Subunit: 208 residues, 4 copies
């Protein structure tokens, strides 16, 4: 409200470590008067866009950290770019798919994330957390909300609000649920994942 807010999102669930990290960190007080406000987004792009727009409008955040599961990635990553296309390798939770679909007619092909990427990487390394920048978020709902948030902020004169996406590995639950015929997944204990999201949130607000 009157104090600076970092908006932290995860995706609603079988198991989703981004939801668990967002839920645990809701209300976290950070230095400089900053507070974390967490929300879960549905895994369907139209409903996720509508929900994220409401959060951006109602919470008026000073920074936006969107998070999601990237099952198969070994380490936390920061997305460099949100691409203005929807192309689903798997259906969303409404059973729907998109193929080569522009997110918005006559909008940029992409938005670069505006989080302090190198500062977050350095904060992770100081906390003994391996991590890196990713240059594709996929074209599923995760990428969609990154593009949606960056576009909304720019169109409302808030392009200076740092905004980006943080993909997290599988947690133990995700890895344990992999069928026996599929390859084993890299994973992290949920406490490691949540700590990485926290360290990133703290780095973002310290810079901003």
């Amino acid at each position: 409200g009157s104090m600076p807010t970092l908006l932290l999102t995860g995706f609603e669930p079988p198991d989703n470590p981004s939801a668990q990290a967002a839920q645990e960190l809701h209300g976290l007080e950070l230095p400089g008067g900053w507070g974390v406000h967490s929300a879960l987004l549905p895994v369907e792009p139209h409903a996720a866009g509508a929900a994220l727009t409401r959060l951006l409008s109602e919470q008026d955040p000073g920074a936006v950290l969107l998070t999601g599961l990237a099952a198969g990635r070994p380490q936390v990553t920061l997305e460099r770019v949100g691409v203005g296309v929807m192309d689903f390798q798997i259906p969303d939770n409404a059973g729907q798919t998109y193929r080569d679909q522009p997110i918005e007619p006559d909008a940029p092909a992409a938005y670069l994330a505006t989080l302090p990427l190198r500062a977050i990487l350095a904060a992770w390394r100081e906390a003994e957390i391996p991590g890196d920048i990713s240059n594709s978020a996929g074209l599923y709902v995760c990428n969609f909300v990154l593009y949606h948030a960056l576009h909304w902020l720019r169109e409302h004169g808030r392009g200076a609000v740092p905004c980006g996406f943080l993909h997290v590995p599988a947690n133990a639950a995700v890895a344990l649920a992999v069928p026996a015929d599929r390859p084993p997944l890299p994973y992290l204990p949920q406490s490691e994942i949540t700590r990485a999201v926290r360290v990133a949130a703290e780095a973002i607000t310290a810079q901003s």
Copy 2:
């Protein structure tokens, strides 16, 4: 005066994109189309200067940029060129860039304008596995994709289909891997060249 497909690869020790471009130079395709091949240096400033000259002098009806993606198992088509330079390894001048925008006050990205699904279908009909890639890296390969798409748009030639085709290692690239590193997926060069040719034929058939 006849329609030209500009086909580029990167200069080498071994580079399958160079070998494919060299073999396909001068190929005649249906509808009057001819392939004009050129090799680009693996240094972005010189590569950009060389590609601008090719785009200007050859005035191509379509642009197929190719390069090696050592480690990928199958040919891929790049969906998007990103306006950032960020090198994990030096270029051939020993130079690296860090989060560097390619051009001030230019788009963050350009989408490739090749007929992607048409190429994938032509590959599948030719028994060639392949797919669309959604990141070209931020090395010289990505740089020339962004460079070409930007140049075409800025010269009123945005309708010229233009994109990037990454190819696997060939046998030579895989054989040169040191014993301490993991083995690479690879394709015989004849498979790689045939995939480039099939993509070229699909591109000109649409236009």
Copy 3:
């Protein structure tokens, strides 16, 4: 018969590059009077063992090159060891599975392959074929027939007959049949696979 025979096996098929390589190379004449005799084995261990025993007895080969598909491997490989256990990650073609099952009571835990492994690797490299030694054949039917063949040969006083296993990558057909939700496979054109089997066969008989 009166001339030295290299016994070359592949596995019966959707698509199997080891079957195609074995079928193409049947009857190949090699230097020194050697001829390739090819046969396809079923993908069920009991029937495969019975069929391989008959081939070993009836063909009386001077060398044995067993081959099979290893979908996901990028390059041809030579198996170092056949392990005396059956443990199936997927059912065989009879719908059957085994778990931690010894192949034969009171038999060795393993047999090392007796092919000239380094000579084959060198012949591959001279032919511009990347390849390597593998130290596990899995515990599916492929490993089973390697162990079965090595055991049979030793128990019949023919331990000196060079015998081993050659795994081949997916061919184009195998890679094209992968569902859209699964990761893309390394593959080789069938002509590359068949040539690698041929080069290995030629190296084996030149040494023996």
Copy 4:
């Protein structure tokens, strides 16, 4: 006089198997069992000599050998120790071996005698993903597995459960990867140590 589980790791720069063994030394388990930990050098001849002494002097009721398998995503149990030494990288003495039999007129392999399925189930109950591995490599890790299983059999102690547990990289191992190499799967050291502990408890509960 009380039953001893011998727990080994390998001496380092960073090795999670060493850290797990050091933390668990002296752990009391139900049924009177105690963990005795030792670190082995990463040179096979010295490692074999050190392990033989531990087996002889500690007379353990079970043997849990552990080591780092940088690149594996989850803890694994080795099914088989192969009687061959073949090093892709030098040991700590700068030495390599090529297709070298570990011992003349000895078995080609020994199967591990740990209760593998019981350990996997204990891991799953503790929310730890894991699996059986069917090759330990042919480096020092495999060497000590074969060495221990052979020594136990040759001293009439084949019934002593004995096996190998490979662990992923920890954070330190993953952070030390150079920028040109691909990122490693990893686990926080506390997860790795807990997996070793759970395996140890499952082993002693069966015996």
